[PDB]
């Protein structure tokens, strides 16, 4: 009966997810994770729905 | 969590912040509320005046639904109308088209007169009201029709 799971407010969850999505369209932050996108022309990287 | 706790910092120090003379002991003043009329009396009188004794009249089998009477002050009283039609009704300050506000369906049992609705007519359906609230409503030009 230790506390194992934590409540996080729904809107804080959504704030964080939106921030993490916005950080995807920043080549400075993607390189800083070590993702090897130096030769990638530009991000957000969008490909066709044929995939 | 455990690493931001002063227990980690007391490591090396003998008493763990509890003293050498006082010697953290099990329950030196008692368990719980022991001593309220005794050695904890000053605290119970300084910070809990009224703790000891019984005052009034008992109620056997009290149901907290006979006493359900949530109060709405006049100052709001248009929050019960949606934003879509509120401006309409406020600029068309007219009888023959006055808005109806069932406060019970919104979840209120009594209307009170805290302050200053505008001079627009309004029909207010309420189980209970106050003297001043109804005075202000019919001075604005409305009417309180009671319901159950």
């Amino acid at each position: 009966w230790r506390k194992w799971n934590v409540k996080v407010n729904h809107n804080e969850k959504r704030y964080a997810t939106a921030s993490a999505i916005a950080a995807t369209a920043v080549a400075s932050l993607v390189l800083a994770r070590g993702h090897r996108v130096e030769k990638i022309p530009e991000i957000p990287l969008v490909v066709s729905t044929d995939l | 969590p455990s690493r931001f706790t002063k227990t980690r910092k007391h490591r090396g120090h003998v008493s763990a912040g509890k003293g050498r003379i006082g010697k953290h002991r099990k329950h030196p003043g008692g368990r719980g509320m022991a001593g309220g009329q005794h050695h904890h009396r000053i605290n119970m009188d300084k910070y809990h005046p009224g703790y000891f004794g019984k005052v009034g009249m008992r109620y056997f089998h009290k149901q907290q639904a006979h006493f359900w009477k949530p109060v709405l002050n006049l100052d709001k009283l248009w929050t019960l109308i949606p934003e879509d039609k509120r401006d309409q009704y406020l600029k068309s300050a007219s009888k023959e088209t006055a808005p109806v506000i069932d406060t019970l369906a919104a979840g209120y049992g009594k209307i009170l007169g805290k302050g200053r609705i505008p001079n627009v007519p309004v029909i207010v359906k309420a189980r209970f009201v106050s003297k001043l609230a109804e005075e202000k409503i019919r001075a604005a030009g409305g009417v309180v029709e009671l319901i159950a």
């Binding site: 009966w1 | 009201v129 109804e134 009417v143």
Partner: protein, 193 residues
């Protein structure tokens, strides 16, 4: 043990509570089990909607009487008026409650219309043959949602007659309070000679 300015706490842990602590780790798995059970039941009653038609009914307790609610069963008079018997209805997906009684014509006729809608919306396969495949849904409650009745309109004229509606409540309260005294006084008046 009593100390600096803090609220008096009533924490009821002076019994052997650690022997009785249920931690609901089973929340997710038990949800999975409920979903699997609903699926199995639906497959077993593969055309049927997994829930009986329940009536619309008015809640007790003046706190809650402003709200209408789903009830248990359709009040034998209601189904008789709907034009079918209780035994047949129970085999057709209609909950019947023999112990509730109709005192309100609005609720009565609303539930009767509910039953007529259900009878028009269902198809009942014969006991003999075909079984004409019919695309079950899983809820009769979603197909017949409980709607709150519209008691009034959104705008009306102002009809003020000068009764003040606070003195009204006041006088109702006062006559309730002093009813018996006045009846006793009238009795003592009538028994004068």
């Amino acid at each position: 043990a009593i100390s600096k300015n803090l609220p008096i706490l009533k924490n009821h842990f002076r019994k052997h509570w650690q022997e009785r602590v249920k931690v609901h780790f089973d929340q997710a798995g038990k949800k999975v089990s409920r979903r699997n059970a609903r699926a199995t039941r639906a497959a077993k009653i593969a055309p049927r909607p997994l829930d009986l038609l329940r009536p619309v009914v008015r809640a007790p307790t003046v706190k809650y009487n402003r709200k209408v609610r789903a009830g248990r069963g359709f009040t034998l008079a209601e189904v008789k008026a709907a034009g079918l018997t209780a035994a047949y209805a129970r085999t057709i997906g209609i909950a019947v409650d023999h112990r509730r009684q109709n005192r309100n014509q609005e609720i009565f006729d609303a539930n009767v219309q509910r039953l007529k809608e259900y009878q028009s919306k269902i198809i009942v396969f014969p006991r003999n043959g075909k079984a004409p495949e019919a695309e079950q849904v899983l809820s009769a409650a979603a197909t017949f949602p409980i709607a709150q009745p519209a008691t009034d309109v959104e705008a009306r004229a102002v009809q003020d007659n000068g009764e003040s509606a606070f003195r009204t409540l006041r006088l109702a309260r006062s006559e309730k309070k002093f009813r018996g005294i006045r009846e006793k006084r009238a009795r003592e008046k009538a028994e004068a000679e």
